[PDB]
mmCIF file of C-alpha atoms in Angstrom:
data_model
loop_
_atom_site.group_PDB
_atom_site.id
_atom_site.type_symbol
_atom_site.label_atom_id
_atom_site.label_comp_id
_atom_site.label_asym_id
_atom_site.label_seq_id
_atom_site.Cartn_x
_atom_site.Cartn_y
_atom_site.Cartn_z
ATOM 1 C CA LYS A 127 21.027 -8.584 -10.422
ATOM 2 C CA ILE A 128 18.805 -6.977 -12.504
ATOM 3 C CA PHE A 129 14.237 -7.896 -12.459
ATOM 4 C CA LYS A 130 12.460 -8.255 -15.362
ATOM 5 C CA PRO A 131 9.568 -5.845 -14.967
ATOM 6 C CA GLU A 132 6.910 -8.394 -16.379
ATOM 7 C CA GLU A 133 8.918 -10.799 -13.353
ATOM 8 C CA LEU A 134 8.907 -8.612 -10.722
ATOM 9 C CA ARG A 135 5.218 -7.879 -11.434
ATOM 10 C CA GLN A 136 4.281 -11.166 -11.254
ATOM 11 C CA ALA A 137 5.607 -12.167 -8.064
ATOM 12 C CA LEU A 138 4.977 -9.273 -6.320
ATOM 13 C CA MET A 139 1.126 -9.168 -7.712
ATOM 14 C CA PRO A 140 -0.138 -12.034 -5.264
ATOM 15 C CA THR A 141 0.816 -10.006 -2.471
ATOM 16 C CA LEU A 142 -1.218 -6.934 -3.775
ATOM 17 C CA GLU A 143 -4.110 -9.087 -4.561
ATOM 18 C CA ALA A 144 -3.863 -9.834 -1.103
ATOM 19 C CA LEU A 145 -4.696 -6.553 -0.008
ATOM 20 C CA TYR A 146 -7.339 -6.324 -2.304
ATOM 21 C CA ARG A 147 -9.036 -8.925 -1.248
ATOM 22 C CA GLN A 148 -9.720 -7.704 2.375
ATOM 23 C CA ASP A 149 -13.370 -6.306 2.460
ATOM 24 C CA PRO A 150 -13.907 -4.302 4.087
ATOM 25 C CA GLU A 151 -11.294 -3.373 5.578
ATOM 26 C CA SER A 152 -8.970 -2.556 1.937
ATOM 27 C CA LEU A 153 -11.664 -0.365 0.732
ATOM 28 C CA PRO A 154 -10.313 3.221 2.590
ATOM 29 C CA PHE A 155 -7.162 2.343 0.621
ATOM 30 C CA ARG A 156 -8.236 1.357 -3.312
ATOM 31 C CA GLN A 157 -8.168 4.980 -4.215
ATOM 32 C CA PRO A 158 -6.034 8.642 -2.895
ATOM 33 C CA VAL A 159 -7.067 10.395 -0.064
ATOM 34 C CA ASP A 160 -8.447 13.340 -1.955
ATOM 35 C CA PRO A 161 -7.874 16.813 1.107
ATOM 36 C CA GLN A 162 -9.974 18.478 -1.229
ATOM 37 C CA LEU A 163 -13.061 16.257 -1.573
ATOM 38 C CA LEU A 164 -13.442 15.482 2.343
ATOM 39 C CA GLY A 165 -12.912 19.416 3.868
ATOM 40 C CA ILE A 166 -9.293 18.412 5.189
ATOM 41 C CA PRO A 167 -6.576 20.860 4.556
ATOM 42 C CA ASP A 168 -4.291 19.586 7.130
ATOM 43 C CA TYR A 169 -3.899 16.149 5.658
ATOM 44 C CA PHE A 170 -0.427 17.355 2.806
ATOM 45 C CA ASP A 171 0.774 19.263 6.089
ATOM 46 C CA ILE A 172 1.162 15.774 7.595
ATOM 47 C CA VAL A 173 1.171 13.957 4.740
ATOM 48 C CA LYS A 174 4.188 14.675 2.342
ATOM 49 C CA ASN A 175 4.384 11.629 0.371
ATOM 50 C CA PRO A 176 0.812 10.064 -0.422
ATOM 51 C CA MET A 177 0.353 6.734 -0.852
ATOM 52 C CA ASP A 178 -2.840 4.042 -1.800
ATOM 53 C CA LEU A 179 -3.428 0.736 -3.364
ATOM 54 C CA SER A 180 -4.412 2.241 -6.464
ATOM 55 C CA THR A 181 -1.585 3.958 -7.283
ATOM 56 C CA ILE A 182 0.810 1.163 -5.848
ATOM 57 C CA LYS A 183 -1.220 -1.252 -8.615
ATOM 58 C CA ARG A 184 0.023 1.264 -11.715
ATOM 59 C CA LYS A 185 2.784 1.596 -11.074
ATOM 60 C CA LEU A 186 3.280 -2.224 -10.644
ATOM 61 C CA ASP A 187 1.762 -2.792 -13.524
ATOM 62 C CA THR A 188 3.795 0.306 -15.669
ATOM 63 C CA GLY A 189 7.793 -0.858 -15.262
ATOM 64 C CA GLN A 190 7.842 1.983 -11.979
ATOM 65 C CA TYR A 191 9.389 -0.649 -9.503
ATOM 66 C CA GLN A 192 13.208 -1.852 -10.099
ATOM 67 C CA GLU A 193 13.302 -3.452 -7.393
ATOM 68 C CA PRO A 194 11.397 -5.160 -4.769
ATOM 69 C CA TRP A 195 12.383 -3.011 -2.044
ATOM 70 C CA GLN A 196 10.785 -0.205 -3.637
ATOM 71 C CA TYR A 197 7.286 -1.806 -4.261
ATOM 72 C CA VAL A 198 7.843 -2.275 -0.388
ATOM 73 C CA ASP A 199 8.545 1.098 0.481
ATOM 74 C CA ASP A 200 5.140 1.789 -1.128
ATOM 75 C CA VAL A 201 3.076 -0.229 0.813
ATOM 76 C CA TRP A 202 4.998 0.482 4.050
ATOM 77 C CA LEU A 203 4.366 4.079 3.049
ATOM 78 C CA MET A 204 0.907 3.489 2.761
ATOM 79 C CA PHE A 205 0.227 2.392 6.101
ATOM 80 C CA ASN A 206 2.582 4.975 7.882
ATOM 81 C CA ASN A 207 0.473 7.485 6.378
ATOM 82 C CA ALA A 208 -2.956 6.758 7.475
ATOM 83 C CA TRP A 209 -1.307 5.054 11.043
ATOM 84 C CA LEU A 210 0.278 8.874 11.424
ATOM 85 C CA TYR A 211 -2.952 10.920 10.815
ATOM 86 C CA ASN A 212 -5.716 8.821 12.034
ATOM 87 C CA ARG A 213 -6.823 8.079 15.666
ATOM 88 C CA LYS A 214 -6.031 4.570 16.909
ATOM 89 C CA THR A 215 -9.371 3.612 17.584
ATOM 90 C CA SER A 216 -10.784 4.735 13.609
ATOM 91 C CA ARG A 217 -11.812 2.597 11.414
ATOM 92 C CA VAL A 218 -9.265 3.686 8.938
ATOM 93 C CA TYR A 219 -6.215 3.405 11.693
ATOM 94 C CA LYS A 220 -7.870 -0.150 12.055
ATOM 95 C CA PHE A 221 -8.698 -1.177 8.624
ATOM 96 C CA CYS A 222 -4.667 -0.035 8.212
ATOM 97 C CA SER A 223 -3.449 -2.503 10.547
ATOM 98 C CA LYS A 224 -5.575 -5.725 9.149
ATOM 99 C CA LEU A 225 -4.079 -5.054 5.728
ATOM 100 C CA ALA A 226 -0.999 -4.403 7.372
ATOM 101 C CA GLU A 227 -1.354 -8.437 9.475
ATOM 102 C CA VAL A 228 -1.903 -9.437 5.483
ATOM 103 C CA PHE A 229 0.807 -7.886 3.898
ATOM 104 C CA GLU A 230 4.045 -9.322 6.260
ATOM 105 C CA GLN A 231 2.093 -13.113 6.109
ATOM 106 C CA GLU A 232 2.420 -12.426 1.792
ATOM 107 C CA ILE A 233 5.707 -10.539 1.631
ATOM 108 C CA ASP A 234 8.186 -11.981 3.757
ATOM 109 C CA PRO A 235 8.366 -15.494 1.383
ATOM 110 C CA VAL A 236 8.157 -13.868 -1.703
ATOM 111 C CA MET A 237 10.984 -11.409 -1.302
ATOM 112 C CA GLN A 238 12.888 -14.147 0.000
ATOM 113 C CA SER A 239 12.211 -16.268 -2.700
ATOM 114 C CA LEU A 240 13.059 -13.046 -5.144
#
């Protein structure tokens, strides 16, 4: 099965929009973590492969996911990075958990249809 790039984008986009719709929970995820601006030099020692919503959106818009599971892997990468780096009761961690709840609800039927 070979996916047409614009069809894959159309099918997956609503799941990404669902994440952006979460306010305030998407706010820490709408742009990359910048350890230099934040002064957290330990971040890239723990998070080897950073990911965020803006990067996923760009990849989804520019034919970078040839198969749906590649998009799903990047969403989970974003979540797992945040859940590894941050305290469980931190705002980021709690917001991450809400996005993951929304994502699983939205993605499951889409992947079955694809």
